[PDB]
Design an enzyme around this catalytic site. Structure first.
Site, PDB file in Angstrom:
ATOM      1  CG  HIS A  20     -27.052   8.544 -16.966  1.00  0.00           C
ATOM      2  ND1 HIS A  20     -28.370   8.859 -16.718  1.00  0.00           N
ATOM      3  CD2 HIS A  20     -26.835   8.828 -18.270  1.00  0.00           C
ATOM      4  CE1 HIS A  20     -28.929   9.315 -17.827  1.00  0.00           C
ATOM      5  NE2 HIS A  20     -28.016   9.305 -18.786  1.00  0.00           N
ATOM      6  CG  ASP A  27     -28.778   9.732 -22.638  1.00  0.00           C
ATOM      7  OD1 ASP A  27     -28.539  10.055 -21.457  1.00  0.00           O
ATOM      8  OD2 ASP A  27     -29.637  10.309 -23.336  1.00  0.00           O
TER       9      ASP A  27
END
Length: 122
Positions: A47, A89
């Site tokens: 991420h 996300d």
């Protein structure tokens, strides 16, 4: 922004994002990256690597549009940078859900300064 991210994680895992991922392992929440301790930690590593491609927006404060419908996350009509943020996300939230089976309570509040630098690239 952090507000969209938090909601996504909560929607996919049903767990409070701050408590469960705010200081987890060597990559989740506060701080930078480090050698991932487990699958959940790896999600956070990927991420943060994803956020690197963002050159014209703030992944922390910039808001974007997305919808949580039919148990799926769908990024809305956003500007390029915001959409890239949303997709980063989205993949992250799904990654966390996929690894709930190995979530380690002992890693929840981790001593990040003890983490080691990784040689793995983004």
């Amino acid at each position: 922004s952090l507000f969209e991210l938090g909601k996504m994680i909560w929607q996919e895992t049903g767990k409070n994002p701050v408590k469960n991922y705010g200081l987890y392992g060597c990559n989740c929440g506060v701080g930078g990256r480090g050698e991932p301790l487990d699958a959940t930690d790896r999600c956070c590593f990927v991420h943060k690597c994803c956020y690197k491609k963002l050159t014209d927006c703030d992944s922390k404060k910039d808001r974007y549009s997305y919808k949580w419908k039919n148990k799926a996350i769908v990024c809305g009509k956003n500007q390029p940078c915001m959409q890239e943020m949303c997709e980063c996300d989205k993949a992250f939230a799904i990654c966390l859900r996929e690894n709930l089976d190995t979530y380690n309570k002992s890693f929840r509040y981790h001593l990040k300064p003890s983490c080691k630098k990784t040689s793995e690239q983004c």
